[PDB]
Design a protein around this nucleic acid. Sequence first.
RNA 1: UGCUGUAAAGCUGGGUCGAACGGCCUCUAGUGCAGAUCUUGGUGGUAGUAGCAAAUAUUCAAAUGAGAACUUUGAAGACUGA
Length: 125
Amino acid sequence: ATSVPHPKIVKKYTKKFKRHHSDRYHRVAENWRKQKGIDSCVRRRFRGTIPQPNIGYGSNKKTKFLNPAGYKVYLVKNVKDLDVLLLHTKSYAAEIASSVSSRKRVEIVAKAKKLGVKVTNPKGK
RNA sequence: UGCUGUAAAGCUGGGUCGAACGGCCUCUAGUGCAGAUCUUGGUGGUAGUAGCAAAUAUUCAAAUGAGAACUUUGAAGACUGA
């Protein structure tokens, strides 16, 4: 890791928690919802039903919020926004906002390279 | 196209697009939908399916026309039957 050393990153659940019957009807979005029905086999946790979010799945506090390269990600919208990362260049990477213009985006990439700040999305227009 | 969060969700790459929009500290509410034989609008399967069968009945040729079972003219066969 080019970032500050960290323990090996463990994700307890890497799949997505999909709402029950979001596969069955178009009108049911996958955004997680808790079943509140009296008979619900999912709420009652029958064997064979879907995993549900609970606090036991929480990430280890020492590796939480880290991307695979070992950095926490900070959203940058202009050149000046890079400054708060100046003393945190081995633990915080910059991410350029989607709405920054192509002119200003080139300027942010240049300044980050000047300061030694990692950028997570360099290829943007 | 990926990243973050147990999650509600947040961010990002590519495309489309054309005029406004967001973070943070707070304020406020007509603030979150799968259901209500919910409301309005839109759209399927059914399905090229049911079906288009009462009132005797139509036919040949020419003309017209891009095109004629269905229009017009001629020939005829019929019917209403005062």
